[PDB]
Design a protein around this ligand. Structure first.
Ligand SMILES: OC[C@H]1O[C@@H](O[C@H]2[C@H](O)[C@@H](O)[C@@H](O)O[C@@H]2CO)[C@H](O)[C@@H](O)[C@H]1O
Ligand SMILES: OC[C@H]1O[C@@H](O[C@H]2[C@H](O)[C@@H](O)[C@@H](O)O[C@@H]2CO)[C@H](O)[C@@H](O)[C@H]1O
Lengths: 151, 151
């Protein structure tokens, strides 16, 4: 790519869905988390959660494509079990049955999300990202890998 | 059909008339219950009941073609053993001695009923459909199967 990238932790290979695993040392500025997978052919929704601990009460960034109402993606945060105000991007960048690359880049003030190498959405941090130590992936997809790389 | 359909409960194959059997877990929004069969050559009436329990005292939706008075179909509900106001469609979409496909689609506000792939009647829910856990079929027909499907 246009930036030299270094591994920040060993890749997850063929992680089985639903997948939950550590983000070693927490999210950090300049970290890129890339998921390579396939949207199921009759997909309804899928979810990628960046969260603090295992119970899901505190999700810093929930990324939720919904193959509903013409296709849209919900971004939100959960705090102490409570969902905040949704940010809906009224566009579906995934296609049922098709491979995708999904990249989350941690910047100081926001996440940047790229889908198939193209910027899709930004999401301002609502909570401290460094407390996110867990990624959780679920729903109508499969994954071939999850990589963790830094500039 | 125009939409992919998936089994929700195994089919009842060649169920013997009169038939009564579970709708496992109750009727659900988006469930399509399809009866594939043949109207007897000399048919007087047949009945499909969506009901709460084996008793027959509470029938959410009673669908009753009558080969009488030109041919017509009665739709009604039974509560605590009492019939409500009938809804009569003054048309007979079944032909004596001929195959038919009869499909009940459960929607949020109504059942939609298709006969031979053409819309026949709507029936507003008078009671919650989810309490229906039993289907009962009787009268002048035979069935090759009953399927339970969803999108
Ligand atoms: O905000 C992310 C979550 O949305 C939840 O969906 C509901 C929510 O329960 C309620 O606010 C309602 O108004 O609409 C929302 C649809 O956005 C999902 O159930 C949950 O899985 C998250 O995606
Ligand atoms: O409403 C459904 C039931 O109708 C019963 O017959 C009715 C009849 O249609 C109506 O004209 C009224 O005056 O009296 C009857 C009530 O018993 C059938 O006997 C029953 O099988 C259902 O189809």
């Amino acid at each position: 790519g246009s930036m030299a990238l270094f591994s920040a932790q060993s890749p997850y290979i063929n992680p089985i869905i639903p997948f939950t695993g550590p983000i070693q040392g927490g999210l950090q500025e300049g970290l890129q988390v890339t998921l390579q997978g396939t949207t199921k052919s009759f997909a309804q929704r899928f979810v990628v959660n960046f969260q603090n601990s295992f119970n899901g009460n505190d999700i810093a960034f929930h990324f939720n494509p919904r193959f509903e109402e013409g296709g849209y993606v919900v971004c939100n945060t959960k705090q102490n079990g409570q969902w905040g105000p949704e940010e809906r991007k009224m566009q579906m960048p995934f296609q049922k049955g098709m491979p995708f690359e999904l990249c989350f880049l941690v910047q100081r003030s926001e996440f940047k999300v790229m889908v198939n190498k193209k910027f899709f959405v930004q999401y301002q941090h609502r909570v401290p990202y460094h407390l996110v130590d867990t990624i959780a992936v679920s729903g109508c997809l499969k994954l071939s890998f999850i990589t963790f790389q830094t500039q």
